[PDB]
Structure formats: C-alpha cells, structure tokens
Structure 1
Amino acid sequence: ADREDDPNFFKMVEGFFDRGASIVEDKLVEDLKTRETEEQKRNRVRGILRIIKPCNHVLSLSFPIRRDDGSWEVIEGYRAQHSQHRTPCKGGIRYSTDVSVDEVKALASLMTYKCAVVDVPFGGAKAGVKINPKNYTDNELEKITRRFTMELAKKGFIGPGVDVPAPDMSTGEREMSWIADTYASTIGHYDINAHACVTGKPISQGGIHGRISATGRGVFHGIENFINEASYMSILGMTPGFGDKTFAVQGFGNVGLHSMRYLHRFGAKCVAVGESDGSIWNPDGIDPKELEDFKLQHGTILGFPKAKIYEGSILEVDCDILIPAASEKQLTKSNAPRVKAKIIAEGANGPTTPEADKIFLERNIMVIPDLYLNAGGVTVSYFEWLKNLNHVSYGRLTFKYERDSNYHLLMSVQESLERKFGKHGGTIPIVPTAEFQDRISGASEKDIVHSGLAYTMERSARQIMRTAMKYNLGLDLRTAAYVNAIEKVFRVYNEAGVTFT
C-alpha cells in the first residue's frame, strides 16, 4: 500500500520485540540470581531472547481441489506455530491472496506476545490459505476448508492439545464449523475433547456466547480504560469519557462493525467508515444498525443513504479516535503526518509501521497497540475452549442450588432481625434489589464472558500503564506491552532449562 515504507512484516514485529528487549534486559539480568554473576548472565539472557523470536515450526501445503466447473486447481496453505512454552498453540485462519509464509510467521509471533499480555495460557500460531473467497462457491469453500483441515491434522498442526485455530480475515463461524466437523469425524473420533480442536464455532456446535463480537467488545474496553485515565488525556489535551467523541473505522468486518456498535452504545459518534471499495462520511454520525442492514442488503457500504461517498483516505478523516480494523501496514511514514486523530486504536494486527510509530510519538498521538487491544478475541476463544473441555454449560449444575441458597441467606438476616426487634418492630422483609434478583442464581455463560473479558482487559491495561510509568515511556504503550510479554515468556524459558538439549 506504500512503496516508500513497506517493511518485511516478520522483521517489523521482531523490531518491536527488540525494542522492548532493550528496555528490560537489565531487569532480567538482575533478577537472575545465579552464581555466574559474571556477564555470561547478560549472555544467557540474550541467548534466550534469540530463541524466543523465531517460529519453531512452519508447515507449507499444496493440495488439489476440483472446482465446480470440473477444473483441477492447486491450493496453497500455511500454518506457523511460533512458540510452545504454553500449549496448545492458538491463532486464526486467514483466507486471502496476500497470504505468505512471512505474513503467517509474523502474525503467529504476535499471537504469542498477545496471549502473554492478557495472561492467556497459549502459545502463538497462525494459518493462511492463499485464495480470494469471493471467487469461489460455497461448495468450493467447504471443500477447501475440509481438505486443509486434514492436511494440517496429518502432520500435527491442528488438535485440542497442539494447535487450536479460529477465524480471521474472510473466515468465520461457517468455516470453523467445517473444521470442527471433519476433525471430530476422522482423526478425533475417539478423543473426548475433539470439538475443542477449533474455536469460533457456532453455538449449536460448541461455540460460546459473544465470540463473534468479542474482539469488538474488547476494543471498547481497551479504549475505555485509557480514555478514562486523566493523566493520559491531559498529554493529549482531551476530556475523559466517551460522551463527546468522534471516531472513524477502517474496515467494516467482524472487528470493525462490533467496535462501532459498542462505541456508539456509550455515546461516541461514528463519522467515517472505510472499506475495500471506498469510504463514507457524515459528521453528524452513522448508525451501526442501519449501516449493517444496508451492507447485508447490497453487499457494499457505498451508496448508503445517510452519508456521502467520501474521497481521500479514511485514515486521514478528522476525528478523535482512528480504528484501523482491516489489514496490516496501513499507517506508514507517508500518511502518518496527516492523521488528524489523537488516539489510534489498533483493532487489526500490525496496522502501524515502526516509522509511523516514531512520527506518532513526536506528535503526541497515542497508539493503543494490537498486542493489547484486539486480544478480546483470543480471550473469549480461551473461554470457548474451556467450555468444551468442561462438557457443561456454565451454571447448569448450580442454578437451583444457588438460588435457594441466596433466599435462605437473606432469610437468615430477616429472622435474626425479627428475633431481636420482636413484636412491635413487625415483619422486616429482606428481598433482593432488582439488580441482585437478576444474579440470584449465579453466573451464566453470558455473564462469565462479559465480566471475564472486562476483568482481563482492565487488569492488562493497568499492567501496561504501570510498566510505562516505571520506564518513562510516555505514550509508547507498544514498548510497554512487549516489555510485559517478554518478561513473562522469558521466565518460562529460563526456569524450564530452555530445551531438550
């Protein structure tokens, strides 16, 4: 998208890592309380850091499918497993003609660090199939997905205990259903956990409430934790809260649409929505329900009645918050000086080059990094995986017990008070509030997903802020996130003896 500043994607992520490694290297050496206090301490710390960076296993595939017209075609595919310091590996499947070994390796490493940031016990992985799904029938896409699943399974690149895929660009519920069905019907036929081989499944198939919207929901929570922190909003020259703010959204897919829904719900105003074919704009606000309904009907956002076909880059629209939610390397050395927003919330994976990060720093623009902000997807995938391993819906064993227990608890307060203020205090009814009445039976699956996600995004934001203050990083939240990720992954490699050697 830019021939001036177009770094190799894997190496760009390695650069981000190098930078966080630079900052913590002292802390790692000093923690290390080995008798070698000689600066082979320094040496073993940077030997371990070199082990963490490259992907351990990458599988490249070519397999034939026969198209609906009868033609034979060769499909190309890839899956990278970056780290196995936690198992299984976790990461999505991308259907796109931009798929390549380097793109997949880069996203696989992002998954490792992202999972470490939100304390999700998975190593990183990613897959890609180099096709444009719009050029294939549904029957052909099913054939490609099912065959890809078996080629991965034959070589140990999918399974509930090694590698658990998930949706990404141009895949969703539908593909995940296909993956889970052919895994469970063949190699997983005797495995009690066969349907935990993949997440993002439909509900009828072991999916979890809110997985489709989960990463949008997490984008809201990530922004909210920082947009409500007066210390960061001072440096930006902006007022805490959502009620008065504007935002623009690049990409109207699963991440972009649901980020818009939740931000709109809490008083922000969507001004611009950009897509693969063009952009639309309205300074008075775009309604997400109307835009979705139009998009579902016409297969495009152009021509939306209540906004005007906007020319020029969606990334340079004037707004408070820019949400790049499409592909990677969209903000570069070129357009970074014209961005006009004061908060960049990366919903997409790797939308900002390192050169663009430098410009944004100089310019007091806050980039909330992908490592943290889009990790709501993998957090709720983690909940889905646990739901599959546990083989019950949350609360089903305890709803009645817990309901009865709570009423007897409140009755214990009632009877204790009547016992004391006897006859002429009268009857002293203790009853639930409206809000407690609605929790009287304990959490359900929906409650766990919402509160578990909010808990994770908040706990992770505080850890990033703590680390940024400690090292005087200002608005370089990306380096603070990598610092936390590196510290966690380093400790695992260090206390494990590294490897089987």
Structure 2
Amino acid sequence: DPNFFKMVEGFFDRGASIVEDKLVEDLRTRESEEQKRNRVRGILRIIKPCNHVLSLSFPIRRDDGSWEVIEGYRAQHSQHRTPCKGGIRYSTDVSVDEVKALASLMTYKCAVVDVPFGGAKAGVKINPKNYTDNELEKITRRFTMELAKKGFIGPGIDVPAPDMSTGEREMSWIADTYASTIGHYDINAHACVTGKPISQGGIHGRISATGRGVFHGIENFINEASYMSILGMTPGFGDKTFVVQGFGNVGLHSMRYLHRFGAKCIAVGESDGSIWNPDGIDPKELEDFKLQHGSILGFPKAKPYEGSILEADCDILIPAASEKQLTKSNAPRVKAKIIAEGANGPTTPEADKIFLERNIMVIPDLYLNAGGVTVSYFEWLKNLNHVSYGRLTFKYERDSNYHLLMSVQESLERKFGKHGGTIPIVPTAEFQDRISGASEKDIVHSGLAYTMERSARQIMRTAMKYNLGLDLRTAAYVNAIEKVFKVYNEAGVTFT
C-alpha cells in the first residue's frame, strides 16, 4: 500500500497533466504569444509544493511539575486563497510529510466545493491518552501562541480546525488563547479557528455536516441518469441498499439521511464485528444502541454478519472508517456499484483501476466528505458576521409567507361571495414545522446542499470536459487544479 504523500502527489500530477494541454490550448493559447504558454505552465509547478511548513518544539510543564518538550508541525499548502483552512491532529505519527500531503488535499478539496481558502494542516506529535486535560489545554494553548507568532493561525491568515484526534474543546482553547493574547485587538479574533462549541461562536449544523455531505454527494450522482445507466442503477428491484463500514459521526449520519430518503441499510460495520439484515437496520435504533452501550455489537434485529461488509451485496458501500480499506486484494470481490468515500482515503490507487475496469463508480473523498469544510467556511463567516444565520429574517419571512397565502385566499375568494371560505392561509404541516422550527442549521444545511450540488454538476461537467468516465476522482482533482491555476493565472507569481 502507498502513503497519502505519494497517492495525492500522484492524484495531483495525473490531473496536472490532463489539465496542461487543454488549459493551454482552446483556453489560453488563443493568443499564443511565443507559444511559451507551455512555459507559463510553471504555475502548476508552483502549485504542487506545500509553500511553507513550520516545525515546532515547545514545552509544557506536565502536571507532575516536570518539563516535557512537545513537537508539532503546521504546513500551509497554498495562500492562493487567504485563510488557509485545515485541521490539527494530535497523534504520534503525524509527520511533516503527512501534514505536507493532507494540506495539499485540502486546497483541492476546498476548490472543488468552491470554498475560498488555501489548504493547511497541523500535527502535534502527542498521544492525548497520555495526558491530563489540564496538560492538553496547556499543550493546545502554547501550541497556539507559537502558531500565532509565526503566522500560522490568524482569522485572515490560517484558521485551524479539529481532526479525529482533536475536538471542540481544543478548538475552544485555541480560539480563546488567540483572542486573549495575540488577537486581543481583532474584532474577528474568534474566527481564528472553526469547530468550536456553540457557546463560543460555533455554528449550528456542524456535527451532521459531514454526514449530509455524504448524503448529498451520493444523491447528486444517484439521481443522475447517465451515471446510473452505466451502472444499471436506479433499479426496479435493486433500488437503494447501502452498507456503511464504520459507525462514527459521518457513518452514523450518512446512515440516517440515506435512510431518511428511502434507502435500505442492509449492514453496518465497526472495528469489532459487523451486522446484517436485508430487511433494513433503522438508523435511530442502531444509534441509541451504540450510545446506550459501547459498540453496535449484538444489535437486536441484527444477525452478526461476518466477512468484510466491503464484500456485502448492496448498491452503495460507504467506507466511513479506516484508511485504505478497499485494496487490490478485495477490490475485485466487492459487490457495490457505487463506492461513496465517506472516509478520507479509503481506497488505494490500484483498487481504483480495478473498480474503474469493472464499472464500480467511486465517489471521491475529495468531494464526498468536503461537507465539513463547507460548514467550517460557514462558521468563519458566522464569526465574521457577528450574527447567527436567519437571526434577522426568520420573522420577516414568516410574515411575507403568510401574506402570499392570504393573497391567494383573498384573490380566490373574489371569485365567490366569499369571506373566509377558501382557506389557503393554512400552510402544510410540513411547512408549519419548518416555520415554527426556523433556525441556523436550516440555512447551513441549505448552503451545504447548494454547494454539494453545484459542485457535483461541476465535477460531472469536467469528467466530460476531460472525457473521464466514472473516474470521478481524477475529474475532481482536475476540477480543482483548474480552479487553483485560474487564480494564479489572473495574477502570476511576483509579476502576479
């Protein structure tokens, strides 16, 4: 198996090239001055390498009065779009190369869903398990101060975020330290990081963010005829059946919305055993089980399905867990026609070829799980705005809606000696709930849906542009590379 560094490096190169010819030709060779347009492709070579990478060593006084000196890293791949956005990982295996790689992905991931940020990513070579929360707060804050002093953390410079290793606690600590030290004068000091609790400037619609992204990503393609044709999908009996490997936030939430929209969750997966049931596993129940006690293991109404759920027969298989699960090994034995990468990097470059060869459509991690980045862009915006979405309009809207309905009523009653007989004024219960439950998550999820869709359409349009097939992944990176190149293109370097 390869390493993200090489995988992404490859993903990049592959598209960089595909892009090269087209990009130069019909696109800009129009005015082929000296035909040295092939030389102006120097943009791509500037684009590829993660621009700046900071490596720290800083101490914290462990609770037992002793001194430990922690080491961490933070790379900012591109500032072609201002606040570099990216997570912070606390794990003993984080490496400049890991960070260097992921930071790259992030710029491409952001471009795909049109999020105005450069990619960045951090790692503090630490094992949270080995530390008291007090020591964790100390590490995060000291880490922040350093990040802040060398230009790797401000609101308009770099805006970190959690990673499976970190969370809203760490995010709150960071925001706080920045806003009380280095960012004291900044009116948007609290925008220095996203992923914070609601009480500290967080945005509603955050947790489910990543899941809905998976949901909407799969949706946009699954309602696409052409795509579903090549797969023989949109079946009369096959219909909708999904197997979710991994039952965390994303896997959990994916199972929820996929289901809420008429999909049958036949089998769910974990780190221990698996589960099965052709009749359908209910999201809520399985959720409450996993909450009421440890794993989903022994879920009543669940036959302990044994074998890799990856092998399971279903239409859509969502690896919402562990890196590279789909490999050349099991790739040829998979039964699903759609591989929606809920997890970051669950299929190896080889497995891709196999799937490609046997027409298994794999919806790319780059696009599929970019829903979280999408909502973070919204938090940052929330932080800059200094107000929650819909705070000033919900009521205004409620009023106008009612006016529309009352106008239908009044106009219709003018076609009778009516005065209270035709009652449109009454909104559907569904609209009634919506009305009575107007809140941020609403606006947030709308934006998410709008981005996931507008982007799906873009990725599709490029597949064709670049005549790629069900090779959504390279269509994606290409879509991104084109975008990143464009910003530079309408500038340059220093003669930018």
TM-score by length of 2: 0.90
Query: Hey, what's the Cα distance between the residues in 1 that align with 2:425 and 2:297?
Result: 57
The answer to whether the 8 A contact 1:227-1:240 is kept is no
Contact persistence 2:405–2:424 (CA under 8 A): no
Could you say what secondary structure the match of 1:209 adopts? coil
- Asked if the contact 1:249/1:274 (under 8 Å) is kept, the reply is yes
Q: Larger deviation: 239-248 or 211-220?
A: 239-248
2:428 and 2:271 mapped to 1: Cα distance?
A: 49
Task: Encode CA deviations 1:441-483: one digit per residue, 9 max, x unaligned.
Answer: 9964222112111111111111111222233322101111122
Report the CA distance shift for 1:70/1:311 in structure 2 as closer, same or farther (over 3 A). farther
Structure 1 residue matching 2:37: 3-state secondary structure:
helix
Shift of 1:56: 0.6
Deviates more, 1:418-427 or 1:206-215: 418-427
Provide Cα deviations, 1:207-262, integer angstroms capped at 9, x if missing partner.
Answer: 11110110111100111111122222222122359994332223322222211222
**Residue-by-residue CA offset, 1:60-116 (whole Å, 9 max, x unaligned):** 222333444555444332211111111111112223333221221111111111111
C-alpha displacement of 1:405: 4.3
Structure 1 pair 277–64 and aligned structure 2 pair: CA distance change class (3 A): farther
Partner SS for 1:33: helix
| More displaced stretch, 312-321 vs 20-29 | 312-321
Question: TM-score with structure 1 length normalisation?
Answer: 0.89
Cα pair distance change 1:368/1:409, threshold 3 Å: closer
Shift in CA distance, 302/154, structure 1 to aligned 2, threshold 3 Å? farther
- Within the alignment, does 1:331 sit opposite 2:334 as a pair? no
Local SS of the residue matching 1:198: coil
Identify the range of structure 1 (452-461 vs 418-427) with the bigger mean alpha-carbon deviation.
418-427
Q: Identify which range, 303-312 or 173-182, moves more after superposition.
A: 303-312
**Bigger mean CA offset, 383-392 vs 239-248:** 239-248
Asked if the contact 1:145/1:175 (under 8 Å) is kept, the reply is: yes
Report the more deviating stretch, 143-152 or 213-222.
143-152
Equivalence for 1:164: 159
Q: Is the 8 A contact 1:167 1:176 kept in 2?
A: yes
Distance 2:420 2:63 in 1: 81
Aligned partner of residue 119 in structure 2, secondary structure: strand
Shift in Å, 1:51: 0.8
Higher alpha-carbon deviation: 79-88 or 478-487: 478-487
Shift of 1:399: 3.8
In 2: Cα distance, 1:404 partner to 1:211 partner: 28
Q: Assess if the C-alpha contact under 8 Å between 1:228 and 1:240 holds in 2.
A: no
Partner SS state of residue 233, structure 1: helix
329-338 or 199-208, which deviates more:
329-338
Closer, same or farther: CA 363–150 of 1 in aligned 2, 3 Å: same
Q: How far apart, in 2, do the equivalents of 1:164 and 1:203 lie?
A: 17
Alpha-carbon distance change, 150 to 277 in structure 1, aligned in 2, over 3 angstroms: farther
Indicate how the Cα distance of structure 1 residues 68 and 334 shifts in structure 2: closer, same or farther if over 3 A, else same.
Answer: farther
Whether the aligned pair in 2 keeps the contact of 1:166 and 1:199 (CA below 8 Å) is yes
- Aligned positions of 1:78-227 closer than 5 A: 78-227=73-222
CA contact (8 A) 1:112 1:125 kept: yes
Q: Can you give the 5+ residue segments of structure 1 that lack an aligned partner in the other structure? A: 1-5
SS at match of 2:436: coil
Question: Which deviates the most, 13-22 or 424-433?
Answer: 424-433
Name the CA distance, whole Å, in 1 between partners of 2:434 and 2:299: 41
SS at the partner of 1:24? helix
| 8 Å CA contact 1:243, 1:267 repeated in 2 | no
3-state SS of 1:248 partner: strand
Aligned pair in 2 of structure 1 residues 410, 37: CA closer, same or farther (>3 Å)?
same
Change (3 A) 1:317 1:433: closer
Q: Does the Cα contact within 8 Å between 1:64 and 1:75 map onto a contact in 2?
A: yes
Question: By how many angstroms is 1:294 displaced?
Answer: 3.4
For structure 1, which segment, 472-481 or 410-419, has the greater mean C-alpha deviation from structure 2 after superposition? 410-419
Q: Compare 416-425 and 207-216 and name the one that shifted more.
A: 416-425
SS of equivalent residue, structure 1 residue 420: coil
C-alpha contact 2:390 2:443 (8 A) present in aligned 1: no
Q: Is 1:305 the equivalent of 2:305?
A: no
Contact 1:322 1:343 in 2 (8 A): yes
2-side partners of 1:156 and 1:17: how far apart?
27
Q: Which residue of 2 aligns with 1:3?
A: none
Distance 1:252 1:427 in 2: 50
CA contact 2:412–2:422 (8 Å) conserved in 1: no
Residues 67 and 298 of structure 1: CA distance in aligned 2, closer, same or farther (over 3 Å)? farther
CA contact (8 A) 2:402 2:425 kept: no
How much has 1:162 moved relative to structure 2? Answer: 0.7
2:228 aligned partner:
233
Contact 1:243–1:266, Cα closer than 8 Å, also in 2: no
**Matched residue, 1:316:** 311
Distance 1:135 1:299 in 2: 22
Q: Aligned pairs, how many? A: 496
Does structure 1 conserve the Cα–Cα contact (< 8 Å) formed by 2:79 and 2:118?
A: yes
SS at match of 1:90: strand
Contact 1:406 1:440 in 2 (8 A): no
Query: 1:388-416 CA distances to partner (integer Å, 9 max, x unpaired)?
Result: 11112223333444444454555556666
Q: Which segment drifts farther, 477-486 or 94-103?
A: 94-103
Greater alpha carbon shift after TM alignment, 348-357 vs 409-418: 409-418
1:430–1:482 CA distance, 2 compared to 1 (3 A): same
C-alpha distance 241-37 of structure 1, shift in aligned 2 (>3 A): farther
Identity %: 98
- Following TM superposition, by how much is the alpha carbon of 1:422 offset from its aligned partner in structure 2, in angstroms? 7.3
Which piece of structure 1 moves more, 86-95 or 420-429? 420-429
SS of the residue corresponding to residue 469 of structure 1 reads helix
Counterparts of 1:428 and 1:305 in 2: how far apart (Å)? Answer: 48
In 2, Cα distance between the equivalents of 1:38 and 1:200?
48
Distance 2:315 2:29 in 1: 49
Give yes or no for contact 2:29–2:35 (8 Å, CA) kept in 1.
no
Change in 2 beyond 3 A, CA 1:377/1:429: closer
| Greater mean deviation of Cα atoms: 464-473 or 154-163 | 464-473
Moved more, 418-427 or 357-366: 418-427
Report the CA distance shift for 1:136/1:269 in structure 2 as closer, same or farther (over 3 A).
farther
Deviations 1:123-161 (A, max 9, x none): 111112233334433333333322222221121111110
- My pick for the range that moved more, 455-464 or 304-313, is 304-313
Displacement, 1:493? 0.5
1:160-199 residue CA offsets vs partner (Å, 9 max, x unmatched) = 1011112222322222222222222221222100111111
- Answer yes or no: is the 8 Å Cα contact 2:246–2:268 preserved in 1: yes
Q: Which runs of 5+ in 2 are unaligned?
A: none
| 1:395–1:442 contact (8 Å) kept in structure 2 | no
Change (3 A) 1:313 1:457: same
How many angstroms does 1:318 deviate by? 3.4
Q: What is the CA-CA distance between 1:49 and the residue it aligns to?
A: 0.8
Secondary structure of 1:425 counterpart: coil
Query: Equivalents in 2 of 1:123, 1:292: separation in Å?
Result: 35
Q: Secondary structure at the match of 1:216?
A: helix
Match of 2:453 in 1: 458
328-337 or 348-357, larger mean C-alpha shift: 328-337
Residue 279 of structure 1 and its aligned partner are, at CA, apart by 3.7
- Secondary structure of 1:423's counterpart equals coil
Distance 1:242 1:155, change over 3 A: farther
**Bigger mean CA offset, 300-309 vs 51-60:** 300-309
| CA RMSD between the two structures | 3.0
